[PDB]
C-alpha cells in the first residue's frame, strides 16, 4: 500500500524551529513530487510548497506565505520528506499534511501532524456560571451556560448534568484570548424544570488535571 506518515508535531516555541518528517513506503519515492499543506483550526487548507522528482532534479517551490522561512527537503535513500520550519509564529499553528504528486496528482496523503506555536504554560481554566439577569422576561424555555476561560493547552470537555443533558446543547469552538483559550457552552431546558432541577456544567481540563462542576444558580 502507498503510505505517507507525518510526524514531529507538538508545541513549538515562538521564534523557535521545528522539523516535520513524512515517512513513505509502498512506492518508488524518487518518481514523485511531494507537497506540504497546512490547515489552521477553523481555517482553510493552505499550500506551502513542493519538491520535484529525480527527473526534475528535486528542485523546490514555496508559497509567498513561507518562502525563505520554511525549507522542504527529501532523503532519497530513506524515502523521507522534511519540512523545516524556522522562526515559528502563531500563524504556524496548524495540522500539516504531506502528499505525493504525479500523473494521478495528489492521490495519496498522510494523516497529518499537529503543531501549536505558543509560549504559554499549562493553565487550568476558570469556570463561570451563565445565568439570565434578575430582570429578564419569563419564557417557555430558558438558556443557561458556562464560560470556560483562560486555559492551556487544548482541549477541555464540557458536559451538562453528567451528559444527562445532551439535547439542546451548544459547545462553541475555543478562541485564543490573552494567549490562552476560552470557550463557552449553552444548554436549553424548559422553564418549568429550572431552578427546581439543578443544572450543572461539568468541565474537564485533563492537562491541568482539573474537573469542575459548576452549578447554575439563579
Amino acid at each position: 500500500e502507498v503510505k505517507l506518515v507525518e510526524s514531529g508535531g507538538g508545541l513549538g516555541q515562538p521564534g523557535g524551529s521545528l522539523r516535520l518528517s513524512c515517512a513513505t513506503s509502498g512506492f518508488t519515492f524518487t518518481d514523485y513530487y511531494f507537497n506540504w499543506a497546512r490547515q489552521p483550526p477553523g481555517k482553510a487548507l493552505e499550500w506551502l510548497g513542493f519538491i520535484r522528482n529525480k527527473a526534475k532534479g528535486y528542485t523546490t517551490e514555496y508559497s509567498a506565505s513561507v518562502k525563505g522561512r520554511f525549507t522542504i527537503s527529501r532523503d532519497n535513500s530513506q524515502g523521507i520528506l522534511y519540512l523545516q520550519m524556522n522562526t515559528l509564529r502563531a500563524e504556524d499553528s496548524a495540522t500539516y499534511y504531506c502528499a505525493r504528486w504525479g500523473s494521478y496528482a495528489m492521490d495519496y496523503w498522510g494523516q497529518g501532524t499537529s503543531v501549536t506555536v505558543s509560549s504559554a504554560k499549562t493553565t487550568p481554566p476558570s469556570v463561570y456560571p451563565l445565568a439570565p439577569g434578575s430582570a429578564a422576561q419569563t419564557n417557555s424555555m430558558v438558556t443557561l451556560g458556562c464560560l470556560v476561560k483562560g486555559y492551556f493547552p487544548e482541549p477541555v470537555t464540557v458536559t451538562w448534568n453528567s451528559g444527562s443533558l445532551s439535547s439542546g446543547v451548544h459547545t462553541f469552538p475555543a478562541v485564543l484570548q490573552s494567549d490562552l483559550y476560552t470557550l463557552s457552552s449553552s444548554v436549553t431546558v424548559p422553564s418549568s424544570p429550572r431552578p427546581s432541577e439543578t443544572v450543572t456544567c461539568n468541565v474537564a481540563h485533563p492537562a491541568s488535571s482539573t474537573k469542575v462542576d459548576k452549578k447554575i444558580v439563579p
Binding site: 490547515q39 499534511y97 495528489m106 439577569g133 464560560l147 475555543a174 463557552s184 449553552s186 436549553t188
Partner: protein
Amino acid sequence: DVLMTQTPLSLPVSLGDQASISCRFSQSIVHSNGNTYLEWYLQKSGQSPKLLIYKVSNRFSGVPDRFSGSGSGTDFTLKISRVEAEDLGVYYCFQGSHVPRTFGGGTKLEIKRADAAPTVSIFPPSSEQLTSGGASVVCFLNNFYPKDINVKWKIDGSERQNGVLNSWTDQDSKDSTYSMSSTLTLTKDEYERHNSYTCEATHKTSTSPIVKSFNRN
C-alpha cells in the same frame, strides 16, 4: 500571475440535488505539453484532503461516478449529481502549475433548510469572575438559518468594538441550523463604570434587529 477564483464559499443543497462548484482563472492554465493541471479535492470534517478529479476531468479511482470535473482554459467546474450525506464537507480546486500555486478558497457543501431566526440570550458577569477582577458578558444567538448573521455590542447605548470575541458552530447534524456565541470581555473597573449592556443581532429573517440587554443595576 494568474488569479484563481473558486465559488461559492458556501453551497446549500438538498440531498438528491446536483451541486456545481466553480473554479475560474484570470488567464489560461493550459500547459505547453497539452495538459491542464487543475485538480479537485474533498476535505471532510476532521479528515485529510482526498483526491477526486485530476487533470480537469479524470475521476480518481474509487470516487463515485456522481462526481465529474469539466472546464476549459480559464473556467472549470466540479459537478456532483444526486448529492448524499457522505458528500458533505469542503471542496477545493487546486493547481500548482502557475504562480500563485494554490488551493481555492474552498466550497463547504451544507444542507438546505427553512429560514430560522436566532434565539438570542445575554448573560451578565458572574460574581466569581468579578471577584477575580474581570467582567465578561456573553450572548448566545442559537439555532438560526441561514448562517449569515451580524452582532453588535453597545454599552450605555454606544457601540463597542474592543474586547469582543466570537465563535461559531458547524451546521447542526440534527436540525441543520447554526449557532453563535459572542463575549465582550471588560475589566471589573470598566464594567462598574457603565450600566447598560446590549447584544444586538441582525439576521435575514427580520428587518428588525434582535436586541437583548441587561443593566448592572
